[PDB]
Amino acid sequence: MRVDGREKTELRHIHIHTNYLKHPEGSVLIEVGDTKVICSATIEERVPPFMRGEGKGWVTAEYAMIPRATEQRTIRESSGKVTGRTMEIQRLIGRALRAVVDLEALGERTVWIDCDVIQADGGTRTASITGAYVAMVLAFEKLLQAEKVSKIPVKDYLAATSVGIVEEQGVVLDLNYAEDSKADVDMNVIMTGKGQFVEVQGTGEEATFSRAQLNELLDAAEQGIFQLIDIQKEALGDIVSHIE
Amino acid sequence: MRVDGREKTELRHIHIHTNYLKHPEGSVLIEVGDTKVICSATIEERVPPFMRGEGKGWVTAEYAMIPRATEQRTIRESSGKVTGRTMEIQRLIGRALRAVVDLEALGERTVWIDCDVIQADGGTRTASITGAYVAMVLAFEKLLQAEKVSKIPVKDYLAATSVGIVEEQGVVLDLNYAEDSKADVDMNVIMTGKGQFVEVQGTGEEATFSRAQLNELLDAAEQGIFQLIDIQKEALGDIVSHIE
Amino acid sequence: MRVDGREKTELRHIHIHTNYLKHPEGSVLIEVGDTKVICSATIEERVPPFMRGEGKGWVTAEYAMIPRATEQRTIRESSGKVTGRTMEIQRLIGRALRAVVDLEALGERTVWIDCDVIQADGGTRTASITGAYVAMVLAFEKLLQAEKVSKIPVKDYLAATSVGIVEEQGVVLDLNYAEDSKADVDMNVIMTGKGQFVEVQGTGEEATFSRAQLNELLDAAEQGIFQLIDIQKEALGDIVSHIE
Amino acid sequence: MRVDGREKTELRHIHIHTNYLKHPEGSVLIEVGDTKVICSATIEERVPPFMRGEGKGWVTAEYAMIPRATEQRTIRESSGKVTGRTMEIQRLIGRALRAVVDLEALGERTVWIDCDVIQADGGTRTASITGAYVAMVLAFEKLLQAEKVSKIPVKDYLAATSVGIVEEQGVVLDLNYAEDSKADVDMNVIMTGKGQFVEVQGTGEEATFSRAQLNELLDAAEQGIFQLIDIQKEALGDIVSHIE
Amino acid sequence: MRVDGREKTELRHIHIHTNYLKHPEGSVLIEVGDTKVICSATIEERVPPFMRGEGKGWVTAEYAMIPRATEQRTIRESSGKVTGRTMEIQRLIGRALRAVVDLEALGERTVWIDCDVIQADGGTRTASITGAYVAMVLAFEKLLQAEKVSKIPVKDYLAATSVGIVEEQGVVLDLNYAEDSKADVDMNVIMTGKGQFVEVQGTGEEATFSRAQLNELLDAAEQGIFQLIDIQKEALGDIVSHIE
Amino acid sequence: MRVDGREKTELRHIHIHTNYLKHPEGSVLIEVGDTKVICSATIEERVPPFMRGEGKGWVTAEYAMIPRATEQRTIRESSGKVTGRTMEIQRLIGRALRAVVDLEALGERTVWIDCDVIQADGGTRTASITGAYVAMVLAFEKLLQAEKVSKIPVKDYLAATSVGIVEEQGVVLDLNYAEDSKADVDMNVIMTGKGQFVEVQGTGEEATFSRAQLNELLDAAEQGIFQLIDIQKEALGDIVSHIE
């Protein structure tokens, strides 16, 4: 009697497990349907040489999938070799998070963000940003309690999602692997709580998209992301009071 | 008495030198202001194992900058080590070109696209796609004359440009390096002759963008790209008759 | 009123979570106190060239720690570089598991064992073998149900533990990181359900051990391991009926 | 009616384009027939640790070919892997140029020489030295104008050429690729304006050479090189007045 | 009339050639039957950063086999790639030697131990430790004569051997390659002159061992090692007077 | 009363130890004064793909120095990284030996030449060729006895030496390390028993050489090499009868 499946504009089940593991300053396991990512935030009291003494901090991200995160085993990036996909994804995650951090208020420190995918079924890079934001704020909460910053140094909430145009379905939100593999167009969107973009990346896959479709895709991603931000706020509990 | 400089919505000087060098199936030097890129297309009568026997072709791209392409010398990616930036750029160029190739009509062959930047002043990745399209079509023209394909296997023209929101200037088109380094938002846009998108990638740099701005940025990129396509047609001479 | 801490000859809390993740043929999360390891078993219908056509199978293992598995962040082995410690650990895990597999009954297939440490507090390599055994048998159960083997191709149960001689404590079982870092002697022991050894590795750390101590250390490891095997049997449920 | 081809002792067409690109201290495109090499000279106000504080400068060279410089595409040395041929060639170019620089007069600075081959048809390493000398002197001219050196710190002019013994032709000067591939003996010669050698490298290819032939080969290289030096002087214009 | 071959509990011919080569502080060629290893000890007046200023020294070891050390040529570990076997062996040699060095008395210096195998017929890692101990003491003798240490900074003699359980032979000592390749169990033992262990590593190869067998194997290794120590003392000549 | 030292035109002590080690088809230790190199020749019944089915064989060489071959320890090329010097040297050794092998008579087989330097005091690359020739002929003798070739497939004897112009000494033959480090000019010469060259490589080191000096240097190398060939013949014993 229950409706089976998801509507075109409906997220998979989202669960954000906070203080997931003990050692990081900030630790999260994010579940987006079958996609599962361990996100940690590590605080180092150093910044890269290129910016030392300038009084601003930095955020840098690393990404990997455990070999059987995927249905078909993947070759370990062991040192093995780092794929272009990993490199692109790392750049995306780091750029996205830097955009919402008040780097001056962070002070001269680096946030090392690690996103390790333990199960992959689509949307890993955007799940990674969504989980890593929370992990970062959990770390920022510890700094604040330690009196090492005067506020949580974030300018807003930040979350991310995929959207796509899928064979015989049209515009769909939060694609699983099966859906992305038969998507004509796919897109990653990274947005703040005030509805402002930090990153938009759309790709026609052997195919093309109109501007009408771009607007459609974005519309759908915006609401997915506002919902994700609601969930981040659910996960963050009282910490939301330390953010404006 | 002549107006100095460029309007906000004006491209740098664009020059596409065809049959630039002798050995490639297709060879171009593209100049976009001070940005200069050698683009070759190489035809190999093989496709990757993952798709062999399926009767479709493939396009794959490589990118590098000679060490003093840039004002400050860059460390050679010698084997040295391949940067995330290079890997992202290669993925972009290959995805963009694959989208406009009729891969079945190409047959089981790979187009190896090489983009070697000899002078860099912003917009190298988009200059690379713009030049590489022409290099690819020059190669496709040779195949056609050789009776190895029945038409030039392209679905449209394809070109690319950057756009950005720049401190105290607002929306500007085709950013040089100086302008991109003080850009709050920058964007790469890849579009066809029919005004359809193949790739859109926008990044807030320590900052964010509204949807209004996204539409503005896109508007400006569309016309830059239609102009670039006009120039590609200028460069292509009679070959335009072999394309629909 | 409750006794705090552990006796010298007492394991940390052991928990073996079976069918932990969806994609592997066999999946386990093993917890040994704060030490936590994701263990998967992947079946490939191929063996290495050096033994192809000989009708026997193979087991091979890979190991990694996520960067903040540890209290102090570790540099990612990304491709980064693979440490001697990782290489030694992989060799240990693979050798240990091969010893208890009936490789002829497995047929010509490789078991790929992946051990990804998500939290490290000592005993990761032995926790890895203990968890990976179960993951492997879970995979062997699927093969059997699929009629691809005639029995679970194991010759016995197999588990592993550390033991050590610790400053001002003497012989202690299952060392955490703190305890191993002030251990004069440490040892890894790998044993079967019939009390037979597959691997024994003892190291004096800036110090030495007598034969009396070796016997003592082994005695203590044997019972730790019999207890671990009891727990593996608890985790395996009805599958124990398919093993002799 | 015009004689087709080249005499045995005749260079290909030589063209040295100065101030070729904007960013280097010294920039040249050298053309030797179909062989074309972009040569830059970059000044860094540092020397290697092994010689720091000793008041002498250094010259170091890097070499690469763009993938379709060659008739058959070459695999990119991307980081891919650096070939022995590249390593030998780099050593040759750097040794040759160091020999003619007054390193004390240079002061404690490194000249980074980059030789990127955009079209290859034989003689790339010697074309590289010939072009790179000019690029280096163009850089030295800028230093002098900047009052950072008291003279152009060169001890002489320097140029280089190949010579060979070719099936059914005997001793020939400046070999193209076709001619080198059927050469029994080939040789690289590096000489100054005063007729003094900096490097001589002769190789019997599946074959051997007499001393008579060595003298013959050298005779022919000497005059090729004096001609090349004349052309370097043509390219250098008024700068020749700043050299003795 | 002479008995051919070796008893089960008998070493191969052992020869330790001291001051073998000129450049190292300590140089040995050790022969164990056909197994031959060049062992050098190099003194560097530095320790790793992780322990600098703490006043203790360090020992670190490297291992390689020349390509035709083995009956079947091995691929050179050139940079090629370093095997897990090499990494494990290096760790073993370094750990073993550190255990018998008085690191405080050494002072803040590193002993670089190099073990290059020129002929391999089993027992290379244990031959390496046995030879490297002597090479190290030869180096320590030079330091002492130079008044850079107040005694030879060793706590004891140290040597090593393999033992195994071999098809149709039972417990055998010092296995050649042929014997190890049909060994059900093999073991490396590292012991001091006072009969105390520094390392014990036993591996069931597709098979298992009882505790009775472990004791048997150890018994046999102890006497092999006492014999090896006698030979080290033979090789060391008068230097034995500088050790307690 | 004995004259101390060497004349300007005199080799160091040369010793060629044949059948040095057991496993190679051909094995030599060559001593040239303090320079000592283990040279092996390995026969593989395969040639590279680029020449398969063409009925000719191949020779390829690898070179390394053990870390304390040198007075100052060298970093191991472990996989560490392969130096340009090693790559150049390998190319030299392989080219030199190929020139004197009848590759058709060899048949479709590769000779793998390994040159491992155990002590370095100048002239390692030329010592390597001199020793490796003998190792190769020892291997060719085994092939002949096995009826796998119809003659020793060499066209002549081949040996090599350095020569140099040394501060306050002029032209000197067979330079040690000290002498090469204060050499204005150095040269490697590779010659056959009939006085024909296979390779000549001369380098002015911060300095230049005249043609008169080139002739002088060569004269001196020729006689050094004829002497070396005499010694190779001494080492080869009766095998000289199987060569013309």
Nearest to D176 by CA among D4, D37, D32: D32
Pairing outcome for strands A110-119 and A58-65? parallel
CA dihedral angle for residue D118, residue D122, residue D125, residue D126, rounded to 10 degrees: -120
Instruction: Give the three-state DSSP class for B117.
Output: strand
Residue type, C82: V
* Cα separation, B120 vs B74, whole angstroms: 11
For A29, name the nearest residue in chain C, comparing CA atoms only: C118
Taking only Cα atoms into account, the Rg of chain B, rounded to an integer number of angstroms, comes to 18
Query: Known binder of ligand: residue B124?
Result: yes
Contact, B185 vs B171, CB < 8 A?
no
Beta bridge partners of F58: F110
User: What span, in angstroms and rounded, lies between the C-alpha atoms of D161 and D124?
Assistant: 9
- Residue F89 parent element (H or E): helix F84-100
CB contact under 8 A, E66 and F40: yes
CA C44 to chain CA centroid, nearest Å: 21
Distance CA C59, CA B23 (A): 49
The reply to whether D54 touches chain F by the CB within 8 Å rule is no
HEC profile for chain D? CCCCCCCCCCCCCEEEEECCCCCCCEEEEEEECCEEEEEEEEEECCCCHHHCCCCCCEEEEEEEECHHHCCCCCCCCCCCCCCHHHHHHHHHHHHHHHHHECHHHHCCCEEEEEEEEEECCCCHHHHHHHHHHHHHHHHHHHHHHCCCCCCCCECCCEEEEEEEEECCCEEEECCCHHHHHCEEEEEEEEEECCCCEEEEEEEECCCCECHHHHHHHHHHHHHHHHHHHHHHHHHHHHHHHHCC
Query: Is residue E123 classed as helix, strand or coil in its secondary structure?
Result: coil
Q: Using alpha carbons, list the distances in angstroms from residue D142 to B72, C70, D19, D138, D236.
A: 17, 54, 11, 7, 13
**F100: three-class secondary structure by DSSP:** helix
Give me the residues paired with residue D136 across strands: none
Radius of gyration of chain D (CA): 18
SS3 of C109, please? coil
Q: How many angstroms separate the Cα of A116 from the Cα of each of A66, A125, C17?
A: 7, 10, 19
Which neighbouring-strand residues pair with D14? D32
Question: Which neighbouring-strand residues pair with D139?
Answer: none
Distance CA A213, CA A171 (A): 8
Q: Could you tell me the strand order of the sheet in which B183-192 lies?
A: A170-173, A158-166, A183-192, A197-204, B197-204, B183-192, B158-166, B170-173
Distance, in Å, from the CA atom of A29 to the CA atom of A18, rounded to the nearest integer, reads: 7
| Breaks in chain D, after residue numbers (C to N greater than 2.5 Å) | 79
C-alpha to C-alpha distances, B34 to A6, A195, B15, B118, B119, nearest whole angstrom: 51, 37, 11, 10, 7
Distance CA F136, CA D154 (A): 46
Give the integer Cα–Cα distance in Å for F204 and F181.
12
Query: In degrees, to the nearest 5, what angle opens at C-alpha E162 toward C-alphas E158 and E165?
Result: 150
Nearest to A206 among B85, B99, B207 (CB): B99
Element (H, E) at F164: strand F158-166
F11-29 in b/e burial notation, b at 16+ Cβ within 10 A?
Answer: bbebebbbebbebbbbbbb
Bridge-based pairing of strands B14-18 and B35-44 is unpaired
Residue type, D108: E
With b for 16 or more beta-carbon neighbours within 10 A and e for fewer, the D100-128 pattern comes to bbbbebbbbbbbbbbbbbbbbbbbbbbbb
SS3 B93: helix
- Residues F114, E76: C-beta atoms closer than 8 Å: yes
Contact A171, A165 (CB under 8 A): yes
Give the integer Cα–Cα distance in Å for F201 and F242: 31
SS3 percent helix, strand, coil of chain B, rounded to 5, is 35, 30, 35
Residues β-bridged to residue F30: F16, F37
Distance between CA atoms of residues E181 and E176, nearest Å: 9
Residues of chain A with Cβ-Cβ distance to C119 below 8 Å are 21-23
**Residue showing tokens 């092994």:** D50
Give the whole-angstrom CA distance, residue F96 versus residue F90.
Answer: 10
**Cβ distance of D24 and B68 shorter than 8 Å:** yes
Which of these, F52, F44, F51, F24, lies nearest to F110 by C-alpha position?
Answer: F44
Listed residue (B40, B209, B37) closest to B116, CA to CA = B37
Using the CB atoms, write b or e for E194-228: b if 16+ within 10 Å: eebbbbbbbbbbbbbbebebbebbbebbbebbebb
CA distance C146 to C132: 21
Task: Say how far apart CA C71 and CA C79 lie, in whole Å.
Answer: 23
| Residues A204, B91: C-beta atoms closer than 8 Å | no
Residue type, E173: L
The method of structure determination was X-ray
Q: CA-CA distance, A76 to A85, in Å (whole number)?
A: 13
Strands F58-65 and C35-44 come out as unpaired
Q: Give the Cα separation of E65 and E74 in Å (integer).
A: 8
Question: Which string of DSSP letters, residue by residue, matches chain A?
Answer: -PPPS--TT-PPPEEEEES-SSSSSEEEEEEETTEEEEEEEEEES---GGGTTSS--EEEEEEEE-GGGSSSPPPP-------HHHHHHHHHHHHHHHHHB-HHHH-S-EEEEEEEEEE-SS-HHHHHHHHHHHHHHHHHHHHHHTTSSSS--BSS-EEEEEEEEETTTEEEES--HHHHHTEEEEEEEEEETTS-EEEEEEEESSS-B-HHHHHHHHHHHHHHHHHHHHHHHHHHGGGGGG--
H or E stretch at F201? strand F197-204
Residue C36 CB-density burial (10 A; 0-12 exposed, 13-18 middle, 19+ buried): buried
**Which residues from F are below 8 Å from E42, CB to CB?**
67-68, 73
Q: Which amino acid is at A194?
A: K
Strands across the sheet with A14-18, in order?
Answer: A14-18, A26-32, A35-44, A110-119, A58-65
The CA distance from F5 to the nearest CA of chain E, in Å, is 19
Backbone φ and ψ of D136, nearest 5° = -55, -45
Locate the chain E residue with the closest alpha carbon to C205: E99
* Chain centroid, CA C186 distance in Å: 16
Closest CA to A137 of A31, A233, A37: A233
Nearest-CB residue to D203 (from F95, F103, F205): F95
Are the CB atoms for A97 and A131 separated by under 8 Å? no
The answer to whether C22 contacts A34, with C-beta atoms less than 8 Å apart, is: yes
- Is D119 in contact with B23 (Cβ distance < 8 A)? yes
Q: Do chains C and A touch (3 or more CB pairs under 8 A)?
A: yes
Residue type, E136: M
Contact of E14 with E228, CB cutoff 8 Å: yes
Any idea what DSSP says for residue C212?
Answer: H
Do B218 and A199 count as a contact with CB atoms less than 8 A apart? no
Helix axes of D84-100 and D124-145: crossing angle, nearest 10 degrees: 40
| Contact predicate B199/A186, CB 8 Å | no
Say what angle helices B211-236 and B124-145 make with each other, to 10 degrees. 40
**The Cα angle at residue D178 between residues B46 and F187, in degrees rounded to 5:** 115
Q: Which residues of E touch F114 (CB under 8 A)?
A: 66-68, 76
Q: Do C64 and A73 touch (CB under 8 A)?
A: no
Resolution in A: 1.7
C42, C68, C69: residue with CB nearest A68:
C42
User: Whose CA is closest to E134, among E7, E18, E8?
Assistant: E18
Structure tokens at B52: 């062999």
Helix locations, chain E, DSSP H: 84-100, 103-106, 124-145, 177-181, 211-236
CB A21, CB A40: distance < 8 Å: yes
The torsion of the CA quartet F129, F131, F135, F137, rounded to 10 degrees, works out to: 70
**Which residue from A minimizes the CA distance to C114?**
A67
Backbone angles phi, psi at A81, to 5 degrees: 180, 140
Q: Which of B34, B64, B79 sits opposite D81 (nearest CB)?
A: B79
Distance CA D124, CA D64 (A): 10
Task: Tell me the pairing of strands C158-166 and C183-192.
Answer: antiparallel
Look-up of token digits 């790998």: C190
Q: Do E38 and F66 make contact, defined as CB atoms within 8 angstroms?
A: yes
Q: Is F210 on the interface with D (CB under 8 A)?
A: yes
- Quick one: chain C helix, strand, coil %, rounded to 5? 35, 30, 35
Q: Could you tell me which of B40, B43, B22 has the C-alpha nearest to residue B30?
A: B40
Inter-residue contact A163 to A186 (CB < 8 Å): yes
Which residues 63-122 of B are in CB contact (within 8 Å) with D? 64, 66-71, 73, 76-82, 112, 114, 116, 118-119
The closest of C213, E104, E106, F96 to D204, measured between CA atoms, is F96
Return the DSSP state at B118: E
Specify the amino acid at residue F241: S
Residue ranges of E strands in chain B: 14-18, 26-32, 35-44, 58-65, 110-119, 158-166, 170-173, 183-192, 197-204
Q: How far is CA F207 from the centre of its chain?
A: 26
- Residue E142 · residue E192 · CB < 8 Å: no
Helix (H, G, I), strand (E, B) or coil at E124: helix
Inter-residue contact E125 to E188 (CB < 8 Å): yes
Q: Kindly state whether A17 is in contact with chain C, defined as any CB-CB distance less than 8 angstroms.
A: no
Which residues in chain E are contacts of F69 at CB distance < 8 A?
23
Pairing of strands F197-204, D197-204: antiparallel
In sign, the C-alpha dihedral spanning E73, E77, E83, E85 is positive
**Residue E84 carries which DSSP code?**
H
3 state SS of E90: helix
B57 touches chain A (CB under 8 A): no
H or E stretch at E113? strand E110-119
Q: How far is CA A179 from the centre of its chain?
A: 20
Tokens, residue C131: 């968890």
In terms of Cβ atoms closer than 10 Å to its own Cβ (0-12, 13-18, 19+), residue B212 is exposed
Does C144 contact chain A (CB < 8 Å)? no
Instruction: For E175, list phi and psi in degrees, rounded to 5.
Output: -80, 135
Euclidean distance between CA atoms F58 and F98, whole angstroms: 7
Domains along chain D with CATH numbers: 13-244 (3.30.230.70)
As to burial, measured by CB atoms within 10 angstroms (0-12 exposed, 13-18 middle, 19+ buried), residue C53 is exposed
Helix (H, G, I), strand (E, B) or coil at B227: helix
- Say if residues F187 and F125 touch (Cβ distance below 8 Å): no
- Please check whether residue F11 is in contact with residue F227, taking contact to mean a CB–CB distance below 8 angstroms: yes
